[PDB]
């Protein structure tokens, strides 16, 4: 395609997919997918963006901390609670009351599952009011000490003991690759709470606080006819809200195990589908609409779900929260794990390697990541690993000091003996100052690794050096 200028980029982004070789072609198409540049993301958004200027195709891989990244979920609003002593002779809509020091805060809780003897098996306490009061008095999400829960005064039956913990802030789920896809959606620990708080397994598709803006609306074949009147409840916040299902769908839920799903971000009805919890079942087109499969195959850009522990006849409003992409602490290695996704010609045909994108990171990682990226093009020898200097070394100081630094770094010598870049590949193209662009998003002038740019400048000229596009200043010039 002029010799198939396929770039390759890996780094931290505001939005997943995490650890996936998702391909990108437009700017407005990468924003859609990994979108705005945060002050922790900048140099990677730019890296891509100002490449797609000379760019046909870009293959990226988002680096997430696997240990602390989180996909927004419906678990992450609820409130710890443990039925210390199941009562007896209780029933199902017996109301529960959460007090703050003998003072009523929430009074809309309610037992929701008993057995034959009235032994309390499951309850549901809305946290809208309490997290409010709790935030308001420093006890968030700690809680516990002055926070108490009693039953109606009273339900038919007696003896019970509910014990309150903290406000759960761990969404309890992270989706990365798809080999693990619903396998994380089906972890004892996760699936556990989906039972405990009687909700379905519906989570945001990509790690990130950006997922908190999603709001699923679920209606079953049951409350679908009453679709207008049916007053869907809101988990975990509380309160209700008139359904909308029949007022958005023509083709309504067919079988009793089919549900209407309406996904919203910012009041926008981002997606609208009908799915089934029973394998095989299809729409009027023999399209397998069994939940687990539908999503298993790029079914939805926004969310991801699993029929497992999906409450029968469940209808309500799910509120995703606790969503948490942490670039906060993506370790250098967490980057190298990512880059590795390209280290075999068997798998990915990628011609160029945007590497300078780490220019800004911890000087150490600035060097050791790239250094390693070179050792991927080296061992594969179907590419160009192009690489740029660390901001530290080139942007602040005057040229006098500037060059001294660069040359020391390229060997060992003075200050950068340790974090050197002392390698020598015929595939290694290093990258020689650092560019000063304007950031149409944050609306600020910003220094970015120049390598990202020249790489697109290659996909161009011949097959894979002529002024660069959007520069407005270079660290050194020229002369």
Same domain, yes or no: 149 and 163: yes
Last residue of a domain, one of 283, 310, 325: 325
Torsions phi, psi for 247 (to 5 deg): -100, 20
Closest CA to 115 of 146, 74, 79, 160: 160
Query: Which residues are bridge partners to 385 per DSSP?
Result: 353, 428
Closest CA to 315 of 255, 230, 247, 254: 230
Same domain, yes or no: 25 and 132: no
Give the separation between CA 7 and CA 455, rounded to whole angstroms: 7
Method used to determine the 3D structure: X-ray
Q: How many domains does the chain have?
A: 3
Q: Which residues of 329-339 are buried (b: 16+ CB within 10 A; e: fewer)?
A: ebebebbbbbb
Q: Which domain holds residue 448?
A: 1-67+326-479
Same domain, yes or no: 28 and 138: no
Same domain, yes or no: 344 and 285: no
Same domain, yes or no: 356 and 275: no
Q: Residue 446 sits in a domain of what CATH number?
A: 3.40.50.11780
Same domain, yes or no: 192 and 131: no
Within 10 A of 34 (CB to CB), how many other CB atoms are there?
Answer: 25
Give the separation between CA 63 and CA 338, rounded to whole angstroms: 6
Same domain, yes or no: 365 and 460: yes
Same domain, yes or no: 8 and 34: yes
Same domain, yes or no: 311 and 352: no
Same domain, yes or no: 414 and 283: no
The Cα angle at residue 146 between residues 142 and 150, in degrees rounded to 5: 110
Q: Residue 144 sits in a domain of what CATH number?
A: 2.40.10.380
Last residue of a domain, one of 138, 168, 198: 168
Same domain, yes or no: 163 and 179: no
Same domain, yes or no: 160 and 181: no
Report resolution in angstroms: 3.5
First to last CA, the chain: 34
Last residue of a domain, one of 135, 168, 201: 168
């Amino acid at each position: 395609n002029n010799s198939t200028g396929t770039a390759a980029l890996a780094g931290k982004f505001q939005w997943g997919p995490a650890f996936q070789i998702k391909q990108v072609t437009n700017e407005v198409d990468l924003v859609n997918t990994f979108g705005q540049p945060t002050a922790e993301t900048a140099d990677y958004f730019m890296s891509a963006m100002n490449f797609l200027q000379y760019g046909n195709d870009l293959r990226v891989v988002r680096a997430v901390d696997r240990d602390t990244a989180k996909n927004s979920s419906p678990i992450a609003g609820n409130i710890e609670y443990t039925i210390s002593t199941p009562g007896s002779n209780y029933a199902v809509g017996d109301k529960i009351t959460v007090k703050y020091v003998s003072d009523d805060i929430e009074t809309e809780g309610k037992i929701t599952e008993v057995d034959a003897d009235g032994k309390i098996k499951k309850i549901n306490i809305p946290t809208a009011k309490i997290i409010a009061k709790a935030k308001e008095v420093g006890e968030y999400p700690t809680l516990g000490s002055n926070w108490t829960a009693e039953i109606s005064s009273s339900s038919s039956g007696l003896a019970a003991v509910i014990t309150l913990g903290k406000i759960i802030t761990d969404s309890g789920i992270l989706l990365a690759e798809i080999e693990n896809a619903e396998a994380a959606m089906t972890a004892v620990d996760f699936q556990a709470n989906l039972k405990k708080y009687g909700i379905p397994g519906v989570v945001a598709l990509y790690p990130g606080e950006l997922g908190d803006k999603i709001e699923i609306e679920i209606v079953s074949k049951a409350d679908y006819a009453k679709g207008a009147s049916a007053l869907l409840p809101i988990y975990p916040g509380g309160g209700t809200r008139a359904s909308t299902a029949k007022a958005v769908f023509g083709y309504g839920p067919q079988t009793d195990s089919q549900y209407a799903i309406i996904v919203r971000r910012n009041d926008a009805i981002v997606q609208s589908v009908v799915l089934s919890t029973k394998r095989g079942g299809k729409d009027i087109y023999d399209s397998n609409i069994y939940i687990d499969d539908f999503f298993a195959k790029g079914g939805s850009e926004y969310i991801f779900a699993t029929a497992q522990n999906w409450p029968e006849g469940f209808s309500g409003i799910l509120t995703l929260s606790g969503g948490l992409s942490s670039n906060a602490e993506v370790t250098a290695g967490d980057l190298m794990e990512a880059w590795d996704f390209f280290a075999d010609r068997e798998s990915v045909d990628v011609q160029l390697f945007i590497a300078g994108s780490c220019a800004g990171e911890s000087l150490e990682t600035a060097s050791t990541v790239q250094k390693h990226v070179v050792s991927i093009g080296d061992v594969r020898q179907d590419c160009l690993v192009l690489c740029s200097p660390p901001r530290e070394t080139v942007v602040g100081i005057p040229v006098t000091r500037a060059v001294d630094n660069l040359v020391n770094w390229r060997t060992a010598a003075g200050s950068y003996t340790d974090n050197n870049f002392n390698i020598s590949s015929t595939y290694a193209a290093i990258d020689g100052n650092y560019k000063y662009q304007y950031d149409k998003y944050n609306d600020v002038n910003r220094w970015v690794p120049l390598a990202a740019d020249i790489a697109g400048l290659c996909a161009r000229t011949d097959n894979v050096r002529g002024q660069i596009l959007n520069v407005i200043k270079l660290a050194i010039e020229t002369p």
